[PDB]
Amino acid sequence: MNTVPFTSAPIEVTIGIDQYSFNVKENQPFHGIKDIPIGHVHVIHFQHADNSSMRYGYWFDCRMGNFYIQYDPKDGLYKMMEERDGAKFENIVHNFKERQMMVSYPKIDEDDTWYNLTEFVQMDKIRKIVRKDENQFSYVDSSMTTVQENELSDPAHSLNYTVINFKSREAIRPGHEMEDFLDKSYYLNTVMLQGIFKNSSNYFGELQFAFLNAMFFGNYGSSLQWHAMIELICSSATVPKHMLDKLDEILYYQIKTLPEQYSDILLNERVWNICLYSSFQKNSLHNTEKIMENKYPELL
């Protein structure tokens, strides 16, 4: 297990670590999070008590380095940093752990939720969507726009998701206009899977990352990307059986984890109704359809 120590907590804040969250009071003796499961990416996220504007946070993998959080009173936020002196880092962690100044990552043994939400998410691919090469971790916040949003303004602070546009020359072969618009299999299988993503694992990883940024930060462009990647599969008549079965699993766990009270802002009625009831794959997402109909029947 690994540890993200905190220099201090000078401002009252709600701290998220993956799907969990807890409140820290102003100047409370809080020095970080221990027992973080090795083998997965993680996200540590923040919402300030005095200013719920800007949710922000950091995607990281403790196998890539030793990371800690220190508040910056000039820029007014909790910043992730990397400690290159391992001896020094192990000493700081051991002292915080002995004084019991850390919360423990509260994973139930029966619970595979985090694995199920991040199965295909890899830190190296996160660092291509979120470009800041000098760090091994990646900063995301509620306001960051996507490359697609920007085309329709600071490029260094953008989310470089793969652009999906159903009414684009990339999506539509000259001479196959009706075919490609009504059945997006070409765009899915040749352009996206074979051409850009190389395999379904990378496609699902980006879909899962987009969902998590939508949910944890309220990042609107990420919600748009998540729905676009779902609709592209559902609107394709030819999809490998193993991709459809895996998509059903991915979506089930995402719908299961979504806060019930954010459904109105995180779920697009058109996309979901189209995908579950009108699309080529309307009968291929049995688990997702069942949870959606029982948890959010209003949306449908």
Add this chain to the structure above:
Amino acid sequence: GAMNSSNYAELFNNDIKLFVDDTNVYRVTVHKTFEGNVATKAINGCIFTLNPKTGHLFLKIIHTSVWAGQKRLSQLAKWKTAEEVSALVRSLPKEEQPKQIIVTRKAMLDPLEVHMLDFPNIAIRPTELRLPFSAAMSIDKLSDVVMKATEPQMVLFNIYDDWLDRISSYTAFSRLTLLLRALKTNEESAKMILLSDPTITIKSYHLWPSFTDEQWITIESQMRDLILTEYGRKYNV
């Protein structure tokens, strides 16, 4: 955006634009079969593509062979319309290509946008006008060329005859839409009005009779009377 009564003079400015009406593309007769089921038989149709400023009508005749062995013909007809409009645009010199294409039915928007992706600067717009272009097949010379066609064909017409020598394009379009609305509302009575004077004929190279200015005023009045008469009959007014 959409084109309506507020921005109506836009139709007659110097930006080239075309209306596209797909109503008459896919046309059928419905009939009983020997076994007592119902079947359709397609008949030749047409795309009505009109420049409202100049009167130029690009009438693409849709021969029934284009439906052979195809499914979901009502959907296909929209895509075929868009394919043919795209082909027409590509066939025109650059300086004749439209800057806007206005579709009379919103279901044509996606088909046309998708076919026109190569032309990002041509705006594809709907309209809130209820235009009577479906009645184009009530114009005898247009119906005749459509029904006689044995293969796909494009025929060019000026739907305003020589009116633009004497009236503006706004007035010409208003006359056309009144005539077509009357033909749609009561075709027999409208044709009677237009042809009830044998001394006023249709020139070989025209679609409508050779009315003088004063006679056009009378005709337009009679067309308005016809439309109002039919409204009273319909609603018991």
